[PDB]
Amino acid sequence: VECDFSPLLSGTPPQVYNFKRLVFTNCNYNLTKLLSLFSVNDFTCSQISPAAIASNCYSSLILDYFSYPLSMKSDLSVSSAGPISQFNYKQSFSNPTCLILATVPHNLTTITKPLKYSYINKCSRLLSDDRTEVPQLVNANQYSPCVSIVPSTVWEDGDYYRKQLSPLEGGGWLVASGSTVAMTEQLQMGFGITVQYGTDTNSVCPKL
Amino acid sequence: FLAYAKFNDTDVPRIEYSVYLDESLQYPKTIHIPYPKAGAKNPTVKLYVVNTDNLTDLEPAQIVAPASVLTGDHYLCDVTWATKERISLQWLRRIQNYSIIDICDYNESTPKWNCLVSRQHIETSATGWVGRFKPAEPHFTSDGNSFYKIMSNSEGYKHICLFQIDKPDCTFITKGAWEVIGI
Numbered sequence A: 001v002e003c004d005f006s007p008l009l010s011g012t013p014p015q016v017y018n019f020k021r022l023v024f025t026n027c028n029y030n031l032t033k034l035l036s037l038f039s040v041n042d043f044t045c046s047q048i049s050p051a052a053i054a055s056n057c058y059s060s061l062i063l064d065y066f067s068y069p070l071s072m073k074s075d076l077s078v079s080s081a082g083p084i085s086q087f088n089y090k091q092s093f094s095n096p097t098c099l100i101l102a103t104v105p106h107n108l109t110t111i112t113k114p115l116k117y118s119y120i121n122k123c124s125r126l127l128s129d130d131r132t133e134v135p136q137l138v139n140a141n142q143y144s145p146c147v148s149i150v151p152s153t154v155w156e157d158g159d160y161y162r163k164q165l166s167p168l169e170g171g172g173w174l175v176a177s178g179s180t181v182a183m184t185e186q187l188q189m190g191f192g193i194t195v196q197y198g199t200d201t202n203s204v205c206p207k208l
Numbered sequence B: 001f002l003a004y005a006k007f008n009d010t011d012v013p014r015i016e017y018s019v020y021l022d023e024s025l026q027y028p029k030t031i032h033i034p035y036p037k038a039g040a041k042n043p044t045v046k047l048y049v050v051n052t053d054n055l056t057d058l059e060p061a062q063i064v065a066p067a068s069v070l071t072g073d074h075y076l077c078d079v080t081w082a083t084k085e086r087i088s089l090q091w092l093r094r095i096q097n098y099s100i101i102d103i104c105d106y107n108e109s110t111p112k113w114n115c116l117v118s119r120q121h122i123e124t125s126a127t128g129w130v131g132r133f134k135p136a137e138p139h140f141t142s143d144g145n146s147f148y149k150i151m152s153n154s155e156g157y158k159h160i161c162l163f164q165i166d167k168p169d170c171t172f173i174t175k176g177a178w179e180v181i182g183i
């Protein structure tokens, strides 16, 4: 009956373009207990307050977690034209959302660090024209098409990736480019909470 | 702004030849030079732009090459500043019959350099290669909204074409059975 937060606290967090998603239904959470394990640097919310989201009932609660540097805070808005919201990760507006940038402390030894932070700064498709480019903007709550070609961690800032397509996939090429950010002393992560309301299925409630 | 290019010859084969220096030098020096012969690994190239006024805060901002050129190896053959905040990049496919000009404007936030797709400009050749030794460089107007450059026409004669940034076609301002050497 307790919401399983375990996969977030163990292993290496994926990059922003490969965010892992925990879907919580029919359970009971203590969110403040989870955020107490970290060092919360920024906690903003939309269509809901942070104080409420740790204390209300929903039919379903989704928690996306990934590796994210605190220097690119300005880029994790959804009213932004940055590469993060363009090609990597984007939250939906039709339901309350919350965004949390946290830092793994010394007391949390069960989360491993990767070599560096990595994000996509270009993910477009070249048409059978071989002249026409159609930038592949990611949709809300979805993965970019270029996750098929961009590896789990960009080896070097500037690496470009390509994949020729069959006529049944639209022909032409799928094309992407990588970029990196230096790793910090302690791991810097981001969390995206997104709640939904079913009719009789108000099942995810904080415990007492 | 300072735009600079980053070359990477890490995996490019190096030619070696001996240098038999002065009669006092007893052991000749071997000289290593990254030299991509026909078919070898070419050096990669990236283009970065830096804000010289306030640098200690910000980083270099990479300007990625268009997708039309990212289908393989490619060259960077011209960098021209149109205005104080606009930059033009000529890219060139490794198979040198496909070049493209990229017009990139500066944005107050990220992305620092916004390159609209509608102001890309392609240059191809079905007979041979593009240009004489490299495609002509764009000669921008004062306002950076149009540039004259040298192109081949239907009869295959290098003449001056009038390019509009946002419009896809160009207009020849000369013609004849003769060529233009340079603007």
Ligand SMILES: *[C@@H]1O[C@H](CO)[C@@H](O[C@@H]2O[C@H](CO)[C@@H](O[C@@H]3O[C@H](CO)[C@@H](O)[C@H](O)[C@@H]3O)[C@H](O)[C@H]2NC(C)=O)[C@H](O)[C@H]1NC(C)=O
Binding pocket: A155, A156, A158, A159, B008, B009, B010, B011, B044
């Ligand atoms: C400059 O160019 C060199 C030569 O390509 C770059 O180093 C090389 O990077 C490639 C990745 O593009 C490495 O190849 C292999 O990639 C696979 C992918 O999974 C991986 O499993 C292999 O272990 C390996 O990483 C290659 O090893 C590497 N060579 C080196 C480091 O000597 C270099 O990153 C480029 N630098 C810049 C600034 O562009």
Ligand SMILES: *[C@@H]1O[C@H](CO)[C@@H](O[C@@H]2O[C@H](CO)[C@@H](O)[C@H](O)[C@H]2NC(C)=O)[C@H](O)[C@H]1NC(C)=O
Binding pocket: B095, B097, B098, B124, B125, B126, B127
């Ligand atoms: C640029 O050159 C390449 C090769 O020189 C051209 O690709 C060839 O195109 C012809 C006719 O379209 C084909 O018969 C060949 O099979 C192609 N080569 C390969 C390796 O497949 C390409 O068409 C040229 N680009 C332009 C715009 O003309």
Ligand SMILES: *[C@@H]1O[C@H](CO)[C@@H](O)[C@H](O)[C@H]1NC(C)=O
Binding pocket: A030, A032, A033, A036, A206, A207, A208
């Ligand atoms: C939730 O966790 C906080 C952490 O400080 C604790 O104070 C509180 O008693 C917990 N409540 C429940 C119902 O588990």
